[PDB]
Design a protein around this motif. Structure first.
Motif, short mmCIF file in Angstrom:
data_model
loop_
_atom_site.label_atom_id
_atom_site.label_comp_id
_atom_site.label_asym_id
_atom_site.label_seq_id
_atom_site.Cartn_x
_atom_site.Cartn_y
_atom_site.Cartn_z
N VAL A 1 0.79 -1.22 0.00
CA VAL A 1 0.00 0.00 0.00
C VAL A 1 0.83 1.28 0.00
O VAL A 1 1.87 1.37 0.65
CB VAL A 1 -0.96 0.01 1.22
CG1 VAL A 1 -0.15 -0.09 2.50
CG2 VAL A 1 -1.82 1.28 1.21
N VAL A 2 0.37 2.26 -0.77
CA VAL A 2 0.99 3.58 -0.83
C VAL A 2 -0.17 4.56 -0.80
O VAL A 2 -1.33 4.16 -0.94
CB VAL A 2 1.82 3.81 -2.13
CG1 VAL A 2 3.07 2.96 -2.11
CG2 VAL A 2 0.97 3.52 -3.36
N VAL A 3 0.13 5.83 -0.59
CA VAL A 3 -0.91 6.84 -0.56
C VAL A 3 -0.42 8.09 -1.26
O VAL A 3 0.78 8.29 -1.42
CB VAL A 3 -1.30 7.23 0.88
CG1 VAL A 3 -1.84 6.03 1.62
CG2 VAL A 3 -0.09 7.81 1.62
N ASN A 4 -1.36 8.90 -1.72
CA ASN A 4 -0.99 10.14 -2.37
C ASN A 4 -1.34 11.26 -1.40
O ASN A 4 -1.54 11.03 -0.20
CB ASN A 4 -1.72 10.30 -3.71
CG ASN A 4 -3.24 10.44 -3.56
OD1 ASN A 4 -3.95 10.54 -4.56
ND2 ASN A 4 -3.72 10.46 -2.34
N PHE B 1 -3.79 3.37 -2.22
CA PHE B 1 -3.55 2.43 -3.32
C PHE B 1 -3.03 1.11 -2.78
O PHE B 1 -1.91 1.02 -2.29
CB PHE B 1 -2.53 3.04 -4.28
CG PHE B 1 -2.97 4.34 -4.88
CD1 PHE B 1 -3.71 4.36 -6.06
CD2 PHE B 1 -2.69 5.54 -4.23
CE1 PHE B 1 -4.16 5.57 -6.59
CE2 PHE B 1 -3.14 6.75 -4.75
CZ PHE B 1 -3.88 6.77 -5.93
N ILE B 2 -3.85 0.07 -2.89
CA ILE B 2 -3.47 -1.25 -2.39
C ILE B 2 -3.26 -2.28 -3.49
O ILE B 2 -4.13 -2.48 -4.33
CB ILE B 2 -4.56 -1.78 -1.43
CG1 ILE B 2 -4.72 -0.81 -0.25
CG2 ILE B 2 -4.19 -3.17 -0.93
CD1 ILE B 2 -5.87 -1.15 0.66
N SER B 3 -2.11 -2.94 -3.49
CA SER B 3 -1.84 -3.96 -4.49
C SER B 3 -2.58 -5.21 -4.04
O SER B 3 -2.47 -5.62 -2.88
CB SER B 3 -0.34 -4.24 -4.60
OG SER B 3 0.22 -4.54 -3.34
N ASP B 4 -3.36 -5.80 -4.95
CA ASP B 4 -4.12 -7.00 -4.64
C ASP B 4 -3.61 -8.13 -5.51
O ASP B 4 -3.91 -8.21 -6.71
CB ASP B 4 -5.62 -6.75 -4.90
CG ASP B 4 -6.50 -7.91 -4.47
OD1 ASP B 4 -7.72 -7.71 -4.33
OD2 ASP B 4 -5.98 -9.03 -4.28
N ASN B 5 -2.83 -9.01 -4.91
CA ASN B 5 -2.22 -10.13 -5.62
C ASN B 5 -3.17 -10.97 -6.46
O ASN B 5 -2.89 -11.25 -7.62
CB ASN B 5 -1.47 -11.03 -4.63
CG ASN B 5 -0.80 -12.22 -5.31
OD1 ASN B 5 -1.26 -13.36 -5.21
ND2 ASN B 5 0.29 -11.95 -6.02
N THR C 1 -0.92 -6.38 -15.08
CA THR C 1 -0.26 -6.47 -13.78
C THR C 1 -0.70 -7.78 -13.11
O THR C 1 -1.49 -7.77 -12.17
CB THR C 1 -0.64 -5.25 -12.89
OG1 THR C 1 -2.07 -5.11 -12.88
CG2 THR C 1 -0.04 -3.94 -13.45
N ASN C 2 -0.18 -8.90 -13.61
CA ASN C 2 -0.52 -10.22 -13.07
C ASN C 2 0.20 -10.49 -11.78
O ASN C 2 1.43 -10.37 -11.70
CB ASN C 2 -0.07 -11.38 -13.96
CG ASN C 2 -0.55 -11.26 -15.38
OD1 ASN C 2 -1.74 -11.14 -15.64
ND2 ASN C 2 0.38 -11.31 -16.32
N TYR C 3 -0.56 -10.91 -10.77
CA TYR C 3 -0.02 -11.28 -9.47
C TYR C 3 0.97 -10.26 -8.90
O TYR C 3 2.15 -10.56 -8.70
CB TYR C 3 0.65 -12.66 -9.56
CG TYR C 3 -0.29 -13.86 -9.75
CD1 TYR C 3 -1.28 -14.15 -8.81
CD2 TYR C 3 -0.18 -14.73 -10.86
CE1 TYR C 3 -2.13 -15.24 -8.96
CE2 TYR C 3 -1.04 -15.85 -11.01
CZ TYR C 3 -2.01 -16.09 -10.05
OH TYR C 3 -2.84 -17.19 -10.16
N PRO C 4 0.50 -9.04 -8.63
CA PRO C 4 1.35 -7.97 -8.05
C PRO C 4 1.95 -8.46 -6.73
O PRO C 4 1.29 -9.18 -5.94
CB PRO C 4 0.37 -6.84 -7.75
CG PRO C 4 -0.81 -7.12 -8.76
CD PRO C 4 -0.57 -8.47 -9.46
N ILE C 5 3.20 -8.07 -6.48
CA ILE C 5 3.90 -8.43 -5.26
C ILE C 5 4.07 -7.16 -4.44
O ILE C 5 4.49 -7.21 -3.29
CB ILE C 5 5.29 -9.07 -5.58
CG1 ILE C 5 6.18 -8.09 -6.35
CG2 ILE C 5 5.10 -10.34 -6.41
CD1 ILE C 5 6.83 -7.01 -5.49
N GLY C 6 3.69 -6.03 -5.03
CA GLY C 6 3.82 -4.78 -4.30
C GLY C 6 3.52 -3.58 -5.17
O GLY C 6 3.37 -3.69 -6.39
N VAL C 7 3.42 -2.42 -4.53
CA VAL C 7 3.11 -1.18 -5.24
C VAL C 7 3.96 -0.05 -4.67
O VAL C 7 4.26 -0.03 -3.47
CB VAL C 7 1.61 -0.83 -5.09
CG1 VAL C 7 1.27 -0.67 -3.61
CG2 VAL C 7 1.28 0.44 -5.87
#
Length: 279
Positions: free
Chosen positions: A162-165, A171-175, A199-205
């Motif tokens: 997760v990151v934020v602006n 913004f949450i990465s959902d694997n 963006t297949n199988y995100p491991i992070g953002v």
């Protein structure tokens, strides 16, 4: 969707318990000086390195007393102060704050958190935490007060980053959703970024100093896909090498991203041309 080839210019770390060695680099964050802060989970410590991967110092030791950590996973930095936010795994589900010198500041959330899986800090000093197994987002202030929290089992399946602006958007990465899910502080689902086949199988953002959203994955080689906050695809990269299970990513200002993996190492990847001096 073709992607530009990228290759790391720096890699550091090796198995161990000594300085510069790791057991499990589960979390990584970067401060305003581009120092690389890492959560070395099974060594119950936080290690700090410079932008070039050179060891600076470490803090924390196994224990349940001020300045001690127990299975630290994930870290974030308060940009303006250099303070380091740390979260401890499920058993000791809580967060701790240390200043830039490694001095313990405070700890809290042990009776609030359960499964912390992601953490970050917004420009107002608020600490955002995302949890799995129960899909929930909790927001605290520097002093440990719960400012808000909301469930999101309807839009999240395997949150892992997760990151934020600066407009109260999370913004949450959902694997397992093959994308990033965007919410506001009230907990309203707003939109998604990326998707199956992109963006297949995100491991992070990660998020850029330019406000761009970087989504990483290790589905078939390491891949980085860059988007605007509105979801518009801007760039796409891929490494010619497949990494060991990747745990987290962090942005450095100068067009770089740091990747932490199960192979006891961190790799630094240049994801944009630095442009010639004078141009």
């Amino acid at each position: 969707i073709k992607r530009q080839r990228m290759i790391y210019h720096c890699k550091f770390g090796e198995f161990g318990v000594m300085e510069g060695q790791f057991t499990e680099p589960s979390g990584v964050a970067v401060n305003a000086q581009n120092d690389i802060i890492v959560a070395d989970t099974n060594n119950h410590r936080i290690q700090i390195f410079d932008k070039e991967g050179r060891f600076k110092f470490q803090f924390g030791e196994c224990g349940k007393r001020d300045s001690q950590l127990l299975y630290p996973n994930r870290v974030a930095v308060v940009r303006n102060s250099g303070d380091i936010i740390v979260t401890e795994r499920s058993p000791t589900h809580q967060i701790q704050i240390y200043n830039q010198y490694g001095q313990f500041v405070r700890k809290f959330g042990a009776t609030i958190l359960q499964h912390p899986r992601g953490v970050t800090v917004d420009n107002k000093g608020r600490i955002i935490v995302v949890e799995c197994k129960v899909m929930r987002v909790i927001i605290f202030d520097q002093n440990g007060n719960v400012l808000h929290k909301f469930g999101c089992s309807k839009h999240l399946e395997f949150p892992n980053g997760v990151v934020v602006n600066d407009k109260q958007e999370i913004f949450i990465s959902d694997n397992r959703a093959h994308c990033v899910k965007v919410f506001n502080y009230e907990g309203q689902y707003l939109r998604q970024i990326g998707g199956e086949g992109i963006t297949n199988y995100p491991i992070g953002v990660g998020i850029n100093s330019n406000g761009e959203i970087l989504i990483a994955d290790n589905h078939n080689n390491f891949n980085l896909t860059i988007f605007t906050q509105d979801g518009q695809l801007i760039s796409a990269l891929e490494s010619k090498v497949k990494h060991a299970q990747c745990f987290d990513v962090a942005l450095m200002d100068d067009g770089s991203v740091v990747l932490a993996s199960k192979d006891y190492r961190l790799y630094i990847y240049r994801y944009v041309q630095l442009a010639p001096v004078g141009m």
